[PDB]
Each structure stands twice: as structure tokens, then as C-alpha cells.
Design an enzyme around this catalytic site. Sequence first.
Site, PDB file in Angstrom:
ATOM      1  N   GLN A  12       0.825  -1.211   0.000  1.00  0.00           N
ATOM      2  CA  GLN A  12       0.000   0.000   0.000  1.00  0.00           C
ATOM      3  C   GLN A  12       0.860   1.263   0.000  1.00  0.00           C
ATOM      4  O   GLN A  12       0.508   2.276   0.607  1.00  0.00           O
ATOM      5  CB  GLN A  12      -0.982   0.009   1.175  1.00  0.00           C
ATOM      6  CG  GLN A  12      -1.940  -1.174   1.185  1.00  0.00           C
ATOM      7  CD  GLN A  12      -3.017  -1.059   2.249  1.00  0.00           C
ATOM      8  OE1 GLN A  12      -3.545  -2.064   2.725  1.00  0.00           O
ATOM      9  NE2 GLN A  12      -3.353   0.170   2.621  1.00  0.00           N
ATOM     10  N   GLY A  13       1.992   1.205  -0.699  1.00  0.00           N
ATOM     11  CA  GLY A  13       2.852   2.360  -0.857  1.00  0.00           C
ATOM     12  C   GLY A  13       3.763   2.660   0.310  1.00  0.00           C
ATOM     13  O   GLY A  13       4.404   3.718   0.318  1.00  0.00           O
ATOM     14  N   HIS A  14       3.849   1.769   1.292  1.00  0.00           N
ATOM     15  CA  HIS A  14       4.665   1.983   2.481  1.00  0.00           C
ATOM     16  C   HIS A  14       5.961   1.192   2.337  1.00  0.00           C
ATOM     17  O   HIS A  14       5.943  -0.042   2.306  1.00  0.00           O
ATOM     18  CB  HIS A  14       3.907   1.567   3.739  1.00  0.00           C
ATOM     19  CG  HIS A  14       2.573   2.229   3.887  1.00  0.00           C
ATOM     20  ND1 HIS A  14       2.415   3.457   4.493  1.00  0.00           N
ATOM     21  CD2 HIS A  14       1.334   1.833   3.512  1.00  0.00           C
ATOM     22  CE1 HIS A  14       1.137   3.789   4.483  1.00  0.00           C
ATOM     23  NE2 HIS A  14       0.459   2.821   3.893  1.00  0.00           N
ATOM     24  N   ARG A  15       7.083   1.905   2.251  1.00  0.00           N
ATOM     25  CA  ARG A  15       8.406   1.297   2.164  1.00  0.00           C
ATOM     26  C   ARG A  15       9.072   1.397   3.532  1.00  0.00           C
ATOM     27  O   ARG A  15       9.506   2.480   3.941  1.00  0.00           O
ATOM     28  CB  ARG A  15       9.252   1.979   1.091  1.00  0.00           C
ATOM     29  CG  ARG A  15       8.780   1.735  -0.332  1.00  0.00           C
ATOM     30  CD  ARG A  15       9.063   0.309  -0.770  1.00  0.00           C
ATOM     31  NE  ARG A  15      10.494   0.017  -0.772  1.00  0.00           N
ATOM     32  CZ  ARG A  15      11.286   0.170  -1.828  1.00  0.00           C
ATOM     33  NH1 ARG A  15      10.787   0.610  -2.975  1.00  0.00           N
ATOM     34  NH2 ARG A  15      12.577  -0.120  -1.738  1.00  0.00           N
ATOM     35  N   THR A  63       7.716   5.856   6.075  1.00  0.00           N
ATOM     36  CA  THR A  63       6.661   5.001   5.552  1.00  0.00           C
ATOM     37  C   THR A  63       5.473   5.797   5.033  1.00  0.00           C
ATOM     38  O   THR A  63       4.537   5.204   4.487  1.00  0.00           O
ATOM     39  CB  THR A  63       6.189   4.019   6.629  1.00  0.00           C
ATOM     40  OG1 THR A  63       5.708   4.747   7.766  1.00  0.00           O
ATOM     41  CG2 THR A  63       7.330   3.110   7.060  1.00  0.00           C
TER      42      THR A  63
END
Lengths: 210, 210, 210
Positions: free
Chosen positions: C79-82, C88
Amino acid sequence: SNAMNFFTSPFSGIPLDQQVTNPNIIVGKHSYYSGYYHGHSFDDCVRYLHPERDDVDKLVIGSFCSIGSGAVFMMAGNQGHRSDWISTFPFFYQDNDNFADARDGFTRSGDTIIGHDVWIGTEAMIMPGVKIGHGAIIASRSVVTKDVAPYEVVGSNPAKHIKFRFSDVEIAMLLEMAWWNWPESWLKESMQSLCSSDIEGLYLNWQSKA
Amino acid sequence: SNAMNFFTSPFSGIPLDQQVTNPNIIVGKHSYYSGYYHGHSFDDCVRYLHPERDDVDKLVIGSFCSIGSGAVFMMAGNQGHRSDWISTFPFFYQDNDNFADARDGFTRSGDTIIGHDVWIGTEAMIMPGVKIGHGAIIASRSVVTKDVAPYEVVGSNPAKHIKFRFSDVEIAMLLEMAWWNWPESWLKESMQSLCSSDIEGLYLNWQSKA
Amino acid sequence: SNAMNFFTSPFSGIPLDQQVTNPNIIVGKHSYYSGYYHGHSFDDCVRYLHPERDDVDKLVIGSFCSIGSGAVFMMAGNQGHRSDWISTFPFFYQDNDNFADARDGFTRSGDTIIGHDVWIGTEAMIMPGVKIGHGAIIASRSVVTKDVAPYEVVGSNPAKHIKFRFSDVEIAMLLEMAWWNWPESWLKESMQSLCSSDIEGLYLNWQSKA
Ligand SMILES: CN(C)c1ccc(C(=C2C=CC(=[N+](C)C)C=C2)c2ccc(N(C)C)cc2)cc1
Ligand SMILES: CN(C)c1ccc(C(=C2C=CC(=[N+](C)C)C=C2)c2ccc(N(C)C)cc2)cc1
Ligand SMILES: CN(C)c1ccc(C(=C2C=CC(=[N+](C)C)C=C2)c2ccc(N(C)C)cc2)cc1
Ligand SMILES: [Cl-]
Ligand SMILES: [Cl-]
Ligand SMILES: [Cl-]
Ligand SMILES: [Cl-]
Ligand SMILES: [Cl-]
Ligand SMILES: [Cl-]
Ligand SMILES: [Cl-]
Ligand SMILES: [Cl-]
Ligand SMILES: [Cl-]
Ligand SMILES: [Cl-]
Ligand SMILES: [Cl-]
Ligand SMILES: [Cl-]
Ligand SMILES: [Cl-]
Ligand SMILES: [Cl-]
Ligand SMILES: [Cl-]
């Protein structure tokens, strides 16, 4: 008036014997359910309990119980799923001519029995056939798959032993006293003692009276 | 137009400072909550937080926080349940003449403080009084019963240590930099650096400027 | 008639190929979802699966699967969180001029593949990219973060190994037989055998026929 009138108490709630409609749910006095953050009443906390059959597992709950919001009580056994069989798919409960000669995989788990003075945390799930002793504490988000001893604190998923609330002597004193069965006048006299950790002092007082 | 207009983003959501109405909830900028699969706004993720009292535990949330759908923040302490007492049943909060001389079992747990740049997974439950450091990651379905160190990854029920996101030197660099407090123009200049693992390179750049 | 007509079966439910509308959800025959205690259909059990894109992770479910109420299938990757990046917070998915030069942190996790004859307990969450082998059993409230072997029973949060349903020889027999791909007439003939633990006896019978 205020928007607080729309809300319900986190410390209190609607008593169980004032909202339960399923006849297969036995509840004691003063036991309540505070389920504001899940909408439905306590009848919907009990899942798949047939309200018109007398040959099914029953849900028995003692008195002076506190049940948090979103608690779940599974009351349908294995729901027709036999893990020991080749397939867990319940062929017996699918209306299909190709499944006509299937065997019934449903198996009862026994009554779910909640003792007196049990604190059940919010969103805790109770598996079928589980017995929970008097005075036990079910932590929030617990998945109780086994029996819980009296005055035992359990938590996690699956539920495991955390601690006992009191010593073995104190637990034995409370189990013999059984203040949940005292007359209402005895509880009113011992309200200050019930709101303390002095179990041994109350046990000595109860011995002289009874 | 499309049915996609009815949906909300999994990567984004309504910012917290654009939907919070409870005055006992302090939220930073850009922090959002994507709760499509639970309907209610973020105010209903916070459970039993009195919006008209100033002597209760508060919920403080930093900036640049990502909160998944169905996250729960318990904000009522023990809810009047004293495990150390004989009974966990809150006699003090039941209007009954037989419970008139009961003692108040409610105990505050302190403010729930969520730091900056905290990623809270979906359907995670935060127990009262828990402090979560900057940059921490709360895995989905976590039950955070203890404090979480800065940039610590925790998961499971109850929440336990999984790993730290970066080394102790890198964590110290980020805590001194505090990019969440930089001017908006500094973040726009360092967008490529913030979207990478090069903490030491950005720390050297930040030293020359400030 | 009775109030039972309003309810749905705990042993059965609406088949998946009779209610799924998302084209990125591949389901086999006879697989059903009994979700009375969560209202929504199976399409809402699948979270953040874009129904109009062909370059996203897909959800594939075999035949003869049993899915309990409230099961969750995460279908949006990270969901786009690295977590490996400095922050994040998905700057790339917030429309803000100060976040114009951000990098896309979204990363696919691969298709979520559920095999045949899989029993998924109620309120279990399946993380993205997880593969679950044939005949596996997902306990209730499980958080499946890793792959599950065929005919493996897993539970807890995160999901861990509990046991295998049968021996390695029996599992090999079932994987070669693949009764889920038999003609409907073969299942009708072997309904009594499929509702038993006699895997070796059915394997010997299947060898003579095919
Ligand atoms: C956000 N939300 C939905 C709320 C908001 C407030 C409450 C109530 C409450 C909260 C905190 C308290 N303390 C910290 C001491 C004491 C009481 C409360 C409200 C009404 C009520 N009655 C109708 C008797 C009893 C308690 C519950 C849910
Ligand atoms: C099933 N369901 C309810 C859905 C369906 C689709 C989404 C959205 C989405 C899903 C997958 C993506 N990828 C795999 C890259 C990217 C975006 C989405 C929709 C609208 C939106 N906006 C209104 C900005 C932003 C994202 C969310 C929930
Ligand atoms: C409380 N609640 C919402 C309920 C109440 C009853 C049920 C049903 C049921 C419960 C227990 C059974 N046993 C112990 C053997 C068998 C069947 C049931 C109802 C209808 C139905 N059909 C429409 C076919 C099939 C099963 C489900 C949910
Ligand atoms: Cl509650
Ligand atoms: Cl008991
Ligand atoms: Cl609770
Ligand atoms: Cl047991
Ligand atoms: Cl144990
Ligand atoms: Cl989410
Ligand atoms: Cl902090
Ligand atoms: Cl999430
Ligand atoms: Cl702590
Ligand atoms: Cl730990
Ligand atoms: Cl179910
Ligand atoms: Cl597979
Ligand atoms: Cl189930
Ligand atoms: Cl894996
Ligand atoms: Cl394992």
C-alpha cells in the site's frame, strides 16, 4: 441535551438478562454487555446458536460478568468440518444430487460455560465447548481455545496462561464463600470489602456469620 | 462516472486534522486514516474518550502518520475493573441501592502518545497509556500492550519485538534531524532522499544546511 | 414463516462463483462464503483489489473451499509503504505541491493463491502474496503472513505451524488423486469415502479405475 446521552458506559451496560432473547442462552443477574462499538446486542455476539432446538450446545453465563464490546461466542461446534476426513467441505449441507450419499460431519463440542465474576475483554473470541472458571479474566482480542481455570488470567491468540489473580489459598476461600450467591443485603454490607484485595479478611468475616 | 469514485485510496485517506472532532485528540498534519472497510471516521476508532472532560487520558498523534482501517485506540483506562480487587465487576458504576457503598475502581493509564512517522497496520489495537516512538511500525492485527521504541517494528498479540528499521546510528541521526518539523520547502527539496534508504547521506546534507 | 429464514447456514453459504463481481477474483466451483455476522458479501472481504486494472495482484481461489465469516484478503501489496525507506508515509499518493518529486513506494506482492479444499476460519486475515496449498486449514483469527503447505494446519498471529492433517504418503496420494478435478459422477460414487479418514483405501480404488 448533550451528545453523551447517545453513548453507553464503558464501565457499565445493558444487563444480559434484560436483552437476551435466545432461549439457549442462560445468563445470571447483573451480568452486562457494553457493545457500543459493534452496534448489535448480545444475541448477535453469540454466533450460530439455534434458538428453536433443544439438542444443541448451550451458552451458560454466570452472574456479575463483564463482557466487552465485540466479544464472540462460537456456538456451532465444528460447523460440519471434519479435519480428520479427506475433505473439510461439508458435502452433507449442500443441496446437490451429487452429494446425496455424504455423511454428516457436524459434531457438538458441549456447552460453553462462563462462570461467575468473569471479565471478558473486548473483541475476544470463545471457541465452542470452552469452560471458563469463576473469577477468570479474558484479555482483549483473546482466542480462548481451551478451558480457563478459576481466577486465571489468559491472553493472546491462542489464549495461554498469564497469571493467577490470587494465591491458591485465596482462590479456595473465594470458591467456598461464593459471594455471587449471597443475599443482596450481604453484598451491600461487604461492598467496601469486595472493592479491595483483602480476601482473607472477608473470608474470616464470612466464617463468623455463616 | 466510475464506481471508483465511491472508494477511497489504500495509499492515502482523509487527513486526521480534517475529520477529528473530539477535543481530547491531538493530531499532527498530513496524518491520515484510510478506513473504508470499517465505515466510521477516525473519531470512532478512539473508544470511550470523553469529549467534554479535561481530566482524562488524552490521545496525541504526531505528523506524517499512516493509520490502517479498523485501528482501535482504547482510551478509558481499566474501565473500572480492578483485577487486584476481589471482583472485577464495577459495582461503583451500576445504579443499585445494594451497591451504594462501593469504591471507584477506575484508574487512569496516562496519555496514549503516537510519535511522528508512525505506521499503524489495519485492525491494530492500542491499549491505554501506550507510547509509540517516532518511525515505529505497528503490524496489522497487533495488540500493543507495552511501549514501542522509536523505529521499532512490532507485531503479534500481544505485540512483541520483530526488528528495528535501521541501525542505532541511523536512528540517532533521524531523531536529531526530525524532518517532520522541517519547513515545507525543505521536504520538497529532499523528497527523493526521504524516498530512499540513504539516511546517512541525508544526515550529512542536513548538517551543512542547518 | 420462521425467523430462521432470515439467517444463513453455518455449514453452508452463498457459493463464490454466484456472488463475485470483481474480475480480478478467480474462484472455483462449490467454494462458498458464510458471512452472516459481517453483512457484506465476499467482494468486500477482498480489500483494495482494483476491479478495472489487469496489472495488479490477483486473488485465485480453488474449488470446494470453506471461508468463514469476516475473512480478510489484503490485495494491495505494501500500500505504498516502504519500511526500508526513511519514511513510511506515502508522499507519492498525497496530492501536494511539496510532495511533487516523491518516488512511488508501491510494490506488488504477487497473486494470492488459495488451493482446493481449503478451510479458512472466521475473521482470518490473509496477507498479500500468500500461497495456501491444497487441503490446508486456516484457524480462526489467523494472520497468515507466509505460505502454507498443502494439508497443513496453521493458526495464531502471525500464523505458525500446528500440524499436518495426514502423513506424507497420504498427502502425496491426495495430491495425485486430485478429487476436486474428478467428474461429478465420481464424487457422487465416492461420497462415503470422501467423508472418512480412509485415504489409502480411496487411493487404491482410484488406481484401479483411472
Ligand atoms: C466517545 N464515546 C462514544 C464515549 C464517550 C464517553 C463515554 C463515557 C465516559 C467516558 C470516560 C469516562 N471517564 C474517563 C471517567 C467516563 C465516562 C460515558 C458516557 C455516557 C454514560 N452514561 C449514559 C451513563 C456513561 C459513560 C462513553 C463513550
Ligand atoms: C475494492 N475497493 C473498495 C477498492 C478498489 C480500488 C481502490 C484503489 C486502488 C486499488 C489498487 C491500486 N493499485 C494496485 C495500484 C491502486 C488504487 C483506489 C480507488 C480510488 C482512489 N481515489 C479516489 C484516489 C484511490 C485508490 C481502493 C479500494
Ligand atoms: C443465531 N443465528 C443467526 C443463527 C441461528 C441458526 C442457524 C442455523 C443452524 C444452527 C445450528 C445448527 N445445529 C446446531 C445443527 C444447525 C443450523 C441455520 C439457519 C438457517 C439455515 N438455512 C436457511 C438452510 C441453515 C442453518 C444459523 C444462524
Ligand atoms: Cl467495551
Ligand atoms: Cl464454571
Ligand atoms: Cl474491555
Ligand atoms: Cl480443554
Ligand atoms: Cl498455557
Ligand atoms: Cl487500510
Ligand atoms: Cl513519542
Ligand atoms: Cl495497512
Ligand atoms: Cl511499558
Ligand atoms: Cl519483546
Ligand atoms: Cl462462519
Ligand atoms: Cl496452490
Ligand atoms: Cl469458521
Ligand atoms: Cl513465504
Ligand atoms: Cl512455523
